[PDB]
Design a protein around this ligand. Structure first.
Ligand SMILES: [Cl-]
Ligand SMILES: [Cl-]
Length: 231
C-alpha cells in the first residue's frame, strides 16, 4: 500500500524555500519558488537574493536549497525516510567544511504548509578567508554530479548523511566542500529507517534573462540507488 507520506508526493508539488544567512557577518536572505515531482526525482527552482547581492557564490548554496522529492525506486520504498516523515516534516542539520576555508552550519525545517512544501533554512558561516574562493567569488557558475550517502541513525530516530561536493574554481582547480548531516523527524510518529544507500544527483544552473535581481535557476534530478535474480 501507499503510505501517508508517499501519497503527498504522487503529483507535482509547489515548493517554497526561505533562507536567512550570515557568513563572516555578511547577512543575506534568499527566497525560492518552484515545483517538485518526486515520481521523476525532479526539482525546478528559482532563487532570489532579496537583500541585494549574494555575498557567497550561488553554487555553494545548491546543496542547502527538499530530499523528500528524490525518486525512490519501488523496490527501495521502505528506505525513503524523507517522505515517511511527512507532513509533519524533518529537521536537517549540516556542517559544510570548505577545504582550506570556512564552514557553513545549516538548520532546515522541511514540512508542508497546506499544499506547499516548505524548506526553511538558517545558515551561519564562519572562518572564511575574505579573499578565498567563497568570499572572493572564484567559483564557476556550474555544478558536477555527486552521490549522497545515507545511513540510519536508530538512536536519533533519523538518518546520518555524508558526501563531498567538488566546486570548480575559475582557475581549473576544485574547491572541496565536505558535508556532514543529520535528518530527524519533527513529529513523534513512526518513520522509515533505511538500509545504507545513496542518492545520485545531477544539477544544472542557469539564469533568467529577464531577471535583474541576483538569482539562480536550478534544475536538479535526484534518484535513490544502491539496493538491488529476476532476470
Ligand atoms: Cl555565483
Ligand atoms: Cl542531508
Amino acid at each position: 500500500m501507499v503510505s501517508k507520506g508517499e501519497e503527498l508526493f504522487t503529483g507535482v508539488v509547489p515548493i517554497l524555500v526561505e533562507l536567512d544567512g550570515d557568513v563572516n557577518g555578511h547577512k543575506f536572505s534568499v527566497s525560492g519558488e518552484g515545483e517538485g515531482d518526486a515520481t521523476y526525482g525532479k526539482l525546478t527552482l528559482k532563487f532570489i537574493c532579496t537583500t541585494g547581492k549574494l555575498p557567497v557564490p550561488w553554487p555553494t548554496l545548491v546543496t542547502t536549497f527538499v530530499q523528500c522529492f528524490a525518486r525512490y525506486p519501488d523496490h527501495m520504498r521502505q528506505h525513503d525516510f524523507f517522505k515517511s516523515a511527512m507532513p509533519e516534516g524533518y529537521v536537517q542539520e549540516r556542517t559544510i567544511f570548505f577545504k582550506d576555508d570556512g564552514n557553513y552550519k545549516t538548520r532546515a525545517e522541511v514540512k508542508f504548509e497546506g499544499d506547499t512544501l516548505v524548506n526553511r533554512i538558517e545558515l551561519k558561516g564562519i572562518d572564511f578567508k575574505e579573499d578565498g574562493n567563497i568570499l572572493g567569488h572564484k567559483l564557476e557558475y556550474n555544478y558536477n554530479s555527486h552521490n549522497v550517502y545515507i545511513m540510519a541513525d536508530k538512536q536519533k530516530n533519523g538518518i546520518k548523511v555524508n558526501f563531498k561536493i567538488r566546486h570548480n574554481i575559475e582557475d581549473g582547480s576544485v574547491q572541496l566542500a565536505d558535508h556532514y548531516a543529520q535528518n530527524t523527524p519533527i513529529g513523534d510518529g513512526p518513520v522509515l529507517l533505511p538500509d545504507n544507500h545513496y542518492l545520485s544527483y545531477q544539477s544544472a544552473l542557469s539564469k533568467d534573462p529577464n531577471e535583474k535581481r541576483d538569482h539562480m535557476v536550478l534544475l536538479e534530478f535526484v534518484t535513490a540507488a544502491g539496493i538491488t535474480e529476476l532476470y
